[PDB]
Design an enzyme around this catalytic site. Structure first.
Site, PDB file in Angstrom:
ATOM      1  N   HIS A  87     -18.159 -19.078 104.601  1.00  0.00           N
ATOM      2  CA  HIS A  87     -19.114 -20.173 104.501  1.00  0.00           C
ATOM      3  C   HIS A  87     -18.306 -21.466 104.468  1.00  0.00           C
ATOM      4  CE1 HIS A  87     -22.304 -17.270 103.460  1.00  0.00           C
ATOM      5  NE2 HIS A  87     -21.423 -16.712 102.646  1.00  0.00           N
ATOM      6  N   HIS A  92     -24.337 -34.313 105.773  1.00  0.00           N
ATOM      7  CA  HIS A  92     -24.804 -35.389 106.660  1.00  0.00           C
ATOM      8  C   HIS A  92     -24.526 -36.769 106.070  1.00  0.00           C
ATOM      9  CE1 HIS A  92     -28.003 -32.907 109.112  1.00  0.00           C
ATOM     10  NE2 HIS A  92     -26.809 -32.339 109.099  1.00  0.00           N
TER      11      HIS A  92
HETATM   12 CU    CU Z   1     -22.856 -19.973 105.064  1.00  0.00          CU
HETATM   13 CU    CU Z   2     -26.358 -30.710 110.289  1.00  0.00          CU
END
Ligand code: CU
Ligand code: CU
Ligand code: CU
Ligand code: CU
Ligand code: CU
Ligand code: CU
Ligand code: ZN
Ligand code: ZN
Ligand code: ZN
Lengths: 333, 333, 333
Positions: A87, A92
């Site tokens: 992961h 953003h």
């Molecule tokens: Cu992930």
């Molecule tokens: Cu994104």
């Protein structure tokens, strides 16, 4: 940033948001967070359908992180050895390195610490984005909101102060649960086994379920949001993958940043607003009437058939000026 | 409100809008309306497909109701004994009790009278919302627009006056008509029999038809909208369930409130605007060229294949400054 | 217009945009362009799927045409005898005659010259629209952007000057490639033979592919967009048929006109913006970090599974203030 004081924040589970100031006299800080990834099978509807889910901190959405413009976010991301997948995290709200994804790639048994400058105000999606499996990790539940408040608090189009008395965070999740030849939803023994069939459903662009905060009815009954007449609520709404159109039934968006960026003037008096897939938006509302409201995606099929609806239970005194039943239902004369 | 003068308004069928003032010297009034629900089978396309439809006042959309900011809307909603279903009304323009739905639940043979304060300017959806069957009643045709005009009329971003000379109201309806094993659309003897099959189609999120004002081609031929060069038209566009993107082919949105709320500054010069599912938007355009325009949803499949397109026939003198055919189609030299 | 000087512009292929001034001291001109239609079979993905395509100037999108507000666009549209279909052009930037479509109907072996006044600033879609086959010609590739710059250049909400150092043009195309009973995409010998099967797929509203500039991966590898830290890029994004939600991964929309009309104030700090089907939008971004960015539709299924994603390779010096890896991935202590 190396000159600045550090503060450590303890995150809270959605739909709550951790204690924070709006307008603040404080100067910039390095604000420290930690989140721990949890892969888990979750029951997502009333008929026992399961999702092979992936989460930040064990919840859908992940918890909301709140800082002020000019702060630095320093997140420790932990991927326990009990998980099967690698992961990372893409903010953003951040600048560079694919939102931080390139710098936070954690295999099971590993962790990483990322710092970035929160130099832009607004609500911003964060989500997992492992190379080659981005949409799967996102639709399986790995997203949440970073809220960066202006240092002097929220402002209306004329630059007048705005505030909320209580904040709630709603993550809306378009889910893609496969079916077998018998027409029943498939249950998978492991996360990896859900993958191929799920990609096939995803490619149809048609969600099987669309849920607030991890399950049909998550924000209803004992778990309804609450407020009182005269109280101003901030409703943060994130959708990391698909468009939605929030609406408060019996209310309005008094002030709304539908694109979720506080340096822009908000719109007023909205019936329904629009959250673009891959973004978080914010709406203020001051309650004027008591009762049970619905807060929902106003594609009413998506809301009522697929699960994208919650409730807000509001205490206080009824206002006959605003609305009055002149004649109750009675036989036509 | 109990101190105020009452006025009674006679509604007119779409695409017209009942006579009203824009800027007014009048003070607040209780404005009285009545609507009568009609369930009926309607033919919705050129090949005889039928919809088991549900309507306010026998039309899709329901008629547009116009008041001024600060007025009170007082609606008498009648559900004749000839109908099979219970109904109600939810005004997005109203505050409290799920938009009034909780206060207007009318079984066949009953009626109710609701009052609410129209305290927010803009175009607002109203729709039926009976508990447990909300999306079905909405997609079957039970929606329309309440327009609340500012008391001093429309304004541009600089606060300069704006007006329209003629208003048209367009309700766009995503329909979900089931098919049989032979691939032909199903015809149902009663409204109740359409229900289960229709819910199944709804859940696919894919409309069979998307129509303006109740039928493919409703606003074409003898029934095209009309105007003249120099005239300013207001185009009210409602979509109670699904997003749409209106566009005037050969024209523009001179001033557009795509979220439909007049206290916000409009945008200018739009090619295509966006009406969020669960809302009504408003666009002004002043015609500069005569001819036949198309007004359509600019997902061109939705417009041309599924039915979301109408025509406006415009009288007047051609302007060669704005557009001129320099060389008509001729063989390549 | 007959009093004005003429200039002739040589168009360049996407993703570049032909040389032009932003703010200019020049007065209005008749600006002359020519485009030649090319029907051709194109390979659109990594596994050899083909599209029976239709293009302006041999590219998807067609080239971007740039003028200034008050200029007149004079386009010569050529349909060679080697093509099978009639075509025309509809400019959203134009006023009258269905955007010029009614005046530019060219059979194979013919050409026409249209003039119109570019009296409104912004980015505007242009597309083919032959009567009876509009959506097919559009989804098969016949669209591009006309950019009409204000004569004094771009402005922020306070009327301060804005500029770009480099412009890129991205056309996003929802494609509707039919499959055979074997589940493989169909390859058609001629454009006409693709028609019926393609209309059937279109009516499902579900694209098989969604691509930037004609093919999965078009704007990647050797063909990635480029920039440098400190440089401001304009990203023009057109979608003539379907909604999209652009996002720059690791960046922002510093100033965005999502509805694409420059007389409106832009929004700042966007994570993701929204381009309505049937429109072109514009975003400015000034790079602050080097590295490879993704520019994509943030329905991540549409981006990663269906093809709506490109890359921007950015040179320059890393900024640790903006983002720093505090602890690289390492075993959990
Ligand atoms: Cu992930
Ligand atoms: Cu994104
Ligand atoms: Cu009803
Ligand atoms: Cu509603
Ligand atoms: Cu064509
Ligand atoms: Cu068009
Ligand atoms: Zn308060
Ligand atoms: Zn007028
Ligand atoms: Zn520059």
């Amino acid at each position: 940033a190396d000159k600045l004081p550090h503060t450590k924040v303890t995150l809270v589970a959605p739909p709550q948001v951790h204690p924070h100031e709006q307008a603040t006299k404080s100067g910039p800080k390095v604000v420290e967070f930690t989140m721990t990834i949890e892969e888990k099978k979750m029951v997502i509807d009333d008929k026992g359908t399961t999702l092979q889910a992936m989460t930040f901190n064990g919840s859908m959405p992940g918890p909301t992180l709140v800082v002020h413009e000019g702060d630095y976010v320093q997140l420790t991301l932990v991927n326990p050895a009990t998980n099967a997948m690698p992961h990372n995290v893409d903010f953003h709200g951040a600048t560079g390195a694919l939102g931080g994804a390139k710098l936070t790639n954690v295999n099971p048994g590993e962790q990483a610490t990322l710092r970035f400058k929160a130099d832009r105000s607004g609500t911003f999606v964060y989500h997992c984005a492992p190379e080659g499996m981005v949409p799967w990790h996102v639709v399986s539940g790995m997203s949440g909101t970073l809220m960066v408040l202006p240092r002097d608090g929220l402002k209306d189009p004329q630059g007048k102060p705005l505030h909320y008395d209580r904040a709630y965070t709603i993550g809306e999740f378009d889910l893609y649960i496969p079916k077998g030849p018998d027409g029943k939803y498939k249950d998978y023994a492991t996360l990896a086994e859900s993958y191929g069939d799920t990609v096939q459903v995803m490619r149809t662009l048609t969600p099987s379920h669309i849920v607030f905060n991890g399950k049909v009815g998550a924000l209803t009954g004992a778990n309804a949001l609450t407020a009182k007449v005269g109280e101003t609520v901030l409703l943060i709404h994130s959708q990391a993958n698909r468009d939605t159109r929030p609406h408060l039934i019996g209310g309005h968006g008094d002030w709304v940043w539908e694109t979720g960026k506080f340096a822009n003037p908000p719109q007023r008096d909205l019936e329904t607003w629009f959250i673009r897939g891959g973004s978080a938006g914010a709406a203020l509302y001051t309650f004027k009437q008591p009762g049970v409201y619905a807060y929902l995606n106003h594609n009413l099929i998506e809301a009522f058939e697929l699960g994208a609806a919650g409730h807000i239970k509001v205490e206080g005194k009824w206002n006959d000026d605003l609305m009055k039943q002149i004649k109750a239902p009675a036989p036509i004369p």
